[PDB]
């Protein structure tokens, strides 16, 4: 669920889940237009992977709980049977280590009013 | 914000916010196809709202604090400067009033991964 992404971002990266609250087009609630980076390009990413969980049987991607190991800053998901757990751990961990390995652009935080974003 | 959203829903309608965690194609977390029916439609319009919500300057709709008041089951918005207050708290408030009014369908509960929702 969310708590765990939470916890997942900062078991693979070195900031937190705030850092990315309000972050270029895509990090945050929903989106539009153009990811104007990389990380960005991760927030989008993670939102359709969301939207795509839905697509499974009973499967709410902000408050189904799987199975995860983080051994700094190794994260592991353990579900193979819960194909519903198994595919939003997945979604999470692909954007906590896409958030980890991308750059911050400060420059990008607060830019979904701008032309950026259209 | 969030949280106030969820108490404008129990000051307008009878059920809880818990009660649309998981309805029809577009209550809950984002969500695709066609509304099934009117509470689902309320649901599409919020989160439409809320992804509106982002073309605003310093807004982000799931944190951002409103002033509002309940005076059950009536909800009022009390913002006139705070722009992005407004706009929000009202979008809150239309799907609070939406989901009151709307009959609820359990037969639409958990229908995201069926043909329904495609
Ligand atoms: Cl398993
Ligand atoms: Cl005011």
């Known amino acids: 669920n969310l ?8 078991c693979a990266g070195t900031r937190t889940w705030t850092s990315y609250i309000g972050y270029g087009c895509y990090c945050g609630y929903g989106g539009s237009g153009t990811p104007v980076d990389e990380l960005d ?3 989008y990413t993670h939102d359709h992977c969301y939207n795509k ?10 408050i189904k709980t799987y199975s995860y190991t983080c051994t700094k800053p190794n994260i592991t998901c353990n579900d193979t049977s819960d194909s519903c757990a198994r595919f ?3 979604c999470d ?25 259209q």
């Open 41 to 43: 390009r991760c927030c």
């Open 3 to 10: 708590k765990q992404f939470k916890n997942m971002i900062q």
């Open 93 to 117: 961990r692909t954007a906590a280590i896409c958030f980890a390995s991308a750059p911050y652009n400060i420059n990008n935080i607060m830019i979904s009013a701008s032309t950026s974003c």
């Open 88 to 90: 939003i751990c997945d």
């Open 53 to 62: 969980a839905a697509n499974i049987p009973g499967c709410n991607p902000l």
